[PDB]
Design a protein around this ligand. Structure first.
Ligand SMILES: O=c1[nH]cnc2c1ncn2[C@@H]1O[C@H](COP(=O)(O)O)[C@@H](O)[C@H]1O
Ligand SMILES: O=c1[nH]cnc2c1ncn2[C@@H]1O[C@H](COP(=O)(O)O)[C@@H](O)[C@H]1O
Ligand SMILES: O=c1[nH]cnc2c1ncn2[C@@H]1O[C@H](COP(=O)(O)O)[C@@H](O)[C@H]1O
Ligand SMILES: O=c1[nH]cnc2c1ncn2[C@@H]1O[C@H](COP(=O)(O)O)[C@@H](O)[C@H]1O
Ligand SMILES: O=C(O)[C@@H](COP(=O)(O)O)OP(=O)(O)O
Ligand SMILES: O=C(O)[C@@H](COP(=O)(O)O)OP(=O)(O)O
Ligand SMILES: [Mg+2]
Ligand SMILES: [Mg+2]
Ligand SMILES: [Mg+2]
Ligand SMILES: [Mg+2]
Lengths: 462, 462, 462, 462
């Protein structure tokens, strides 16, 4: 049972919009919206959405496993050895938010302060004394973005597993010699840094120039969660505010995925005429180039929707019905929709590119979708007595931590190793005002709900 | 009753080192060490200290008021009008941590997200609708360090008041015309930006080239809190670890202040021979240039203590008894003292230069000294029923906020406006593992105390 | 009669290596090597060559005209209007070395000081008073590389003509409105800057991703000058030194062009066995990335010549027989060939990327190939009495200038407008120790010839 | 006989303004204006002047020798050893335009291409084979401004000699150990780089904070060439155009030097009333900060001439009679005087800061004053048969070079070593349209003289 199975199960359920039925549904953790900071839903005038892994959640492990195959095939085709062809995606290995250390070739799970929670070299989990040889303070400086790359999005799950596979392969294949910073193959030296850059380029190539997009769209039911409650939520949003789409994808791919997402023999609810996906948005923006979009952006262009190409030049006109934009900046959205940052609830899956930057640069309200939450809630419930056991204790602590972490996968929970929160958890708490396994969870809260978090107090104020 | 009066009152008390007496003393909030993250004191192998506003706390309002006088006199001497001579420091106006907006000339108190809590133009406190003309989202982007300057240290209190004085003066003096971004005086235009830069340069000049240092040292009892419990704490630290001094000051000024701090007719405790301040430190480092010190630093130099000048060239030798260093980097300290970051407790007053950067770049443990805490605790206790009143309510909320804030000063508490925490409070909670009104508060905790904070839980984990 | 016709005519001649025959051949200007600074050929230990427009000279106007077609077709395919399909390359318009001003959309011919010699907007040649409206000092700052792009290589001839075509088209087509800095088309604004960037991207695309390479190689006799005296020159060079190839092209394209260049039923001279092009070089380097190659370069890679792909990793081995490199830096060549800069004669066609940078950064000796020289010599000879007329005079001067310039083309000679040298001429004189219509001209000078230039004297030394 | 003796001798002569007398005076090389590019004096509408070493030429060796003393005294006062007190300025050692190599501690004389003409380590002149150990291609990359500092102005003559003195001292004093890149003194390592930076800082300190200015002004006849023909030239310029002053000095120092320069009991010519120096300029600009002045400049300020301080704020008014400016940019001058670049003749002594940058960034016409030319002309005349001997020859060549160079000093002529022009000579030829031993030489040419240089021809055009 992947998280995307939980999501698709919930997606198959029709919406019961009775006030008491809604209220008891959002009792279950699966269907709750979680609050880091109070947000009064009546003050929200625009709802904005991202597409990939937000509106269009890809099925797991099938989609990761497709991207993994195509990235391997790309690497083999530029000269990596054929043995790579015998790797196969294992979803039980990668957890999201790991850090790849390009100097030494390790995947690290760290807390908000750069302290090491887990260190794996290939598939070899390194323990305290051995880690201290490479990390003498058991700490890394995350600001060293030339050395450390943070594998933040669900698109990075294939490459997280692939780096481990590759380091394991070259370490154990007797053609190569392992050195501190890479592999020697006769007179060629492959550093973990340039290996990492190859994987990163191959992933980029597969999305921009290979066959990932074509293969997804030819089998949409296989690859993409679909939910008849989406047009219902969006039309309800439109009754009280404006709705916008902002995606890093191009128009042609967005049109295919979005058409699929709305492909029901009805519109908002059973019995209603179907309407085109575009009719649900006051503003549609493609090729956004987030996070840059939240700074100086790029030039605002207009899409020619007949052909899927950009019209030539910068668009200088007003918002018109049926127009599709490309590029621009977050200011374009505020200006064309007449909104201030705090009037905007932006719903996205990318902790950095969607959530952190819209919050820090623009003061937008934020909703983080976390697809793995669908499954991590289920593990957190039926391992309560395991977390609670660890909680009491605070040697046996190291053992408890281990079997707690293992239920989630080899790299543990997305949110913690034992009693220590991950970097990713702190940034969720820090930047996401609201968060949930799915944005559909908003459907179960009334129009003007006040989401509440307890006021925060310093230690001396308590 | 300034905070420095509270501190000096506590400083006048001899140390009663009876176990039960220590224990009940640290019951009082004034004498407590507050914990943001757990810290096991037995794992600490080096204690490091900063000097200004940490070991050497300057008396308030007298020292701020001296710096204010000298900065005014500097500005008049380069051509500011003589009316400045009639400003006088008012300690009830500035709160620490304000932001000066150089575009529009406002002092702002903001939260961690850049939301506006208070906006003052000169001495005119701007309310919601008027602020929205210049701040349409009531939010500023703190990353815009060219526009916004954060007045973070206790050294900035004079200039915080001075900017307000200056904006008030030019606004109301009919020789000048007020524009959005500055003042017109015939054919001269003075922007708030270049006005701000003048004040900043004048402050710099007074510390580096004027008479602030000479006037402080000629009346040390007037300007500097002194405490016979300091050599006691430091000698106790030395029994279990190494002790180091790292200051941005030069040697000559440090020698004068430190000699004064230890000037008692005894050493660690009454009856013991006096010893030179230098004997209390394993390592003394001046001209540190923090925060840069916590990155690439500068070249390690050696002070000639006979003359107070640097010897020529880079010092390449080992740690020797009686040597005084200048410049270097935090790595110099780790290497010469044989420590890893987490073995180091660094005690400082500068949230950025001491605390944030040693934590983020190096993984040091951190103790933030907050001198105003001596007084803010006293206000927080006898206005409990005023905070608690506000707490219940959550119109009357706006009124409660106001009379809560006013008890602290015109710019409110250092930690909050009402129910909204300031930027400075969040960074304390974020970067300072421990914090107190004074580092002397450590004296009241046993050698191997475990400071405890409750493990943190996400909303879905609760 | 294009310059490539002159070159191919000379190429068809067999080499007569009799001492007196060589000597009288290099009497003719067509076959001379010209000297800016003295160079003693006996001190040269390595001869290095670039490939495109140096060893492999493309036929004119056919190759420019092919690149022009494909760039137009690329632009139409991303959305430029179909009328572009009716442009056709005119070789009489562009001269090499022009500057495109992206602010105002003009092509400029300038001197070494940035003074304007010619200004054309589309096909409209602007005269003094009108130019002064946009260039009030009749001068541009060439260091403003964001505004001004210098169209330096023979690869830029198509785009030089295309920019003029495009500016002429949009100016005269009544769908668009001409503004100072671009064209308005309803609510789209196309700036000359973003238009320029489109052309530049299209040219890049045609070379990297389109069909220019495939179409050249399928009709090599149509597109590329071939000369049986090339293997003769190279084998003679090899008798006295080392020979190397350094190209920005990839291996596969270099292998096709070079195989073609050596495709004769003989080797160095008639009667000798043919040998593979590779046997003529001590060192072959592809994907050089000049000019960066002359600074920090990139990582030295090794080509797999079976497949045409790079082997994985950085090459750490020595120079071996038959190995082909990719990337690296100029230091790689010095180290593997055991040369110092001044031992190296580097032969190239790119004034900046080949000549200027090897001279300034490394102290290499330089030979600039200037294909248009084949024809400009012919114009300079039979318009002697026209230059000489202008020379005497120094109103009629403006008229003489005009009909002098016109014999070369609409944008005049590559080297001057009348009595004023171009930027390109000064940089030739400044950076190219030697220069010629072809590097084959070296064949006509003995092994240890001393090329002589008169010592230079300041005005007060004369 | 220093060059300043030649200049002061010529300065003592009254002006004979008879047409035939002027004409035969400018026959002598001492009184000629030399032409690199043609300049029609009638097209010049503004004459601009720099002050130091242009209008105010300091006497040699006395002024260099004063700056040398004060820089030594500064270095000793921060801790350099007392032996420095026994250095004494030797004017026969330094030539202007040398390069200090901070890696190895050598002074180099180079040509325009970075080729080594002379290499001295302290006072030890290194010959070919020994130089090749540190410079294997006998070439340096001048663009490496972090390694190489070019000692371009007459203000740098003291420090050129001082670096040599210092390297000689530490090399031969047995307290220090010589390494490749500096000196070891026990546990202190002094690199040539940080030694160089000390000298540079000391020179800066002496000009900005020490006693050089005070000591010059208290003995103006000792330190500064004065010439009654200056007000005559300037008033004649004012009859046909505008005249401006632009200096890097402050107002107070400029007022003292300029008052001195005009201190005659008459104005333009004997018998005329004296007028204040300020009356000779349409525009006076101090604190120019050239070369930055020729790019974005700084904010235009107005000097308060009563006090010598800046008025507060940016000056927004027009040009008014009697106003003195500070800062600004070259555009300020063009706008306030209504000039285009080519209407401006700018007269300066700094090859980079005055001449190169006004020419390259703005298209100004340029006149370089070269005080040493007064003496180098005298050496060039009575060593004609020595240069001419070298000229014919082109072993004995190395010997001729040596005794040619020696007549100028230990570092040879400013313009050449033998038959090889220096960097400084090429930049004179490149950037200075006109040049002379003194700007007063303009007095001897009529109002509308056309200065002529022969049109330049490429080798293939000849
Ligand atoms: O690592 C990557 N390399 C290249 N493209 C990516 C990568 N990750 C996500 N994308 C693209 O980003 C787009 C989704 O962005 P979103 O709708 O704003 O979430 C999709 O079109 C993906 O192909
Ligand atoms: O704003 C300022 N301008 C110039 N110097 C300052 C300023 N604030 C603090 N200082 C200096 O910094 C030194 C104290 O640094 P600390 O011991 O590391 O806290 C003192 O010598 C102060 O003069
Ligand atoms: O403007 C251009 N855009 C992209 N590639 C270019 C351009 N101009 C030249 N090239 C490529 O540069 C290579 C030739 O470089 P060369 O042998 O070093 O002269 C050829 O493969 C060309 O395709
Ligand atoms: O190396 C130096 N360090 C500091 N000031 C210098 C130096 N060289 C020249 N100056 C100053 O520059 C001013 C002269 O600039 P000028 O009139 O524009 O030539 C004088 O006031 C000198 O003190
Ligand atoms: O969250 C971020 O964007 C930065 C800034 O945090 P503040 O400066 O806002 O504390 O923290 P980093 O990840 O570099 O530790
Ligand atoms: O003279 C200068 O300012 C630069 C530029 O010369 P061009 O680029 O104008 O040839 O030459 P450098 O001194 O760096 O060799
Ligand atoms: Mg997304
Ligand atoms: Mg401090
Ligand atoms: Mg080429
Ligand atoms: Mg000067």
């Amino acid at each position: 049972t992947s998280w995307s199975d939980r999501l698709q199960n919930a997606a198959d359920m029709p919406a019961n919009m009775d006030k008491h039925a809604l209220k008891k549904y959002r009792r279950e953790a699966y269907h709750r919206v979680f609050v880091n900071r109070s947000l009064a839903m009546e003050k929200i005038k625009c709802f904005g959405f991202n597409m990939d892994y937000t509106l269009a959640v890809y099925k797991s492990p099938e989609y990761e496993s497709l991207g993994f195959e195509l990235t391997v095939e790309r690497l083999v085709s530029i000269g990596y050895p054929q043995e790579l062809l015998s790797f196969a995606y294992d979803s039980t290995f990668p957890t999201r938010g790991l850090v790849f250390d390009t100097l030494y070739g390790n995947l690290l799970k760290v807390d908000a302060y750069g302290n090491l929670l887990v260190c794996a070299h290939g598939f070899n989990f390194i323990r305290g004394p051995e880690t201290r040889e490479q990390y003498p303070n058991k700490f890394i400086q995350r600001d060293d973005t030339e050395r450390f790359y943070i594998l933040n999005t669900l698109f990075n799950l294939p490459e997280t597993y692939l780096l481990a596979c590759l380091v394991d392969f070259f370490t154990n294949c007797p053609r190569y010699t392992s050195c501190e910073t890479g592999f020697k193959d006769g007179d060629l030296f492959m550093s973990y840094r340039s290996m990492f850059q190859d994987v990163r380029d191959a992933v980029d190539w597969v999305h921009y120039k290979g066959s990932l997009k074509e293969k997804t769209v030819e089998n949409l039911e296989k690859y993409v969660v679909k939910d008849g409650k989406l047009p219902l939520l969006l039309s309800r949003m439109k009754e009280v505010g404006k709705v916008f789409l902002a995606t890093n994808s191009d128009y042609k791919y967005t049109d295919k995925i979005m058409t699929y997402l709305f492909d029901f023999p009805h519109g908002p609810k059973p019995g209603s005429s179907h309407r085109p996906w575009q009719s649900y948005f006051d503003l549609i923006l493609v090729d956004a180039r987030k996070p840059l979009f939240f700074g100086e952006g790029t030039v605002l262009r207009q899409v020619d929707t007949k052909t899927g190409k950009l019209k030539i030049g910068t668009y200088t006109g007003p918002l018109q019905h049926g127009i599709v934009y490309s590029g621009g900046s977050s200011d374009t959205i505020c200006d064309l929709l007449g909104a201030k940052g705090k009037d905007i609830l932006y719903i996205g899956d990318h902790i950095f590119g969607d959530i952190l930057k819209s919050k820090k640069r623009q003061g937008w309200r934020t909703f983080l979708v976390i697809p793995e939450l669908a499954q991590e809630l289920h593990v957190w419930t039926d391992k309560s007595s395991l977390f609670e056991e660890l909680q009491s204790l605070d040697r046996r602590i190291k053992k408890v931590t281990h079997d707690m972490d293992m239920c989630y996968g080899m790299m543990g929970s997305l949110f913690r190793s034992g009693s220590r929160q991950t970097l990713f958890a702190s940034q969720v708490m820090r930047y996401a005002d609201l968060y949930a396994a799915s944005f559909i969870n908003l459907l179960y809260y009334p129009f003007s709900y006040l989401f509440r978090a307890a006021h925060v107090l310093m230690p001396h104020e308590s």
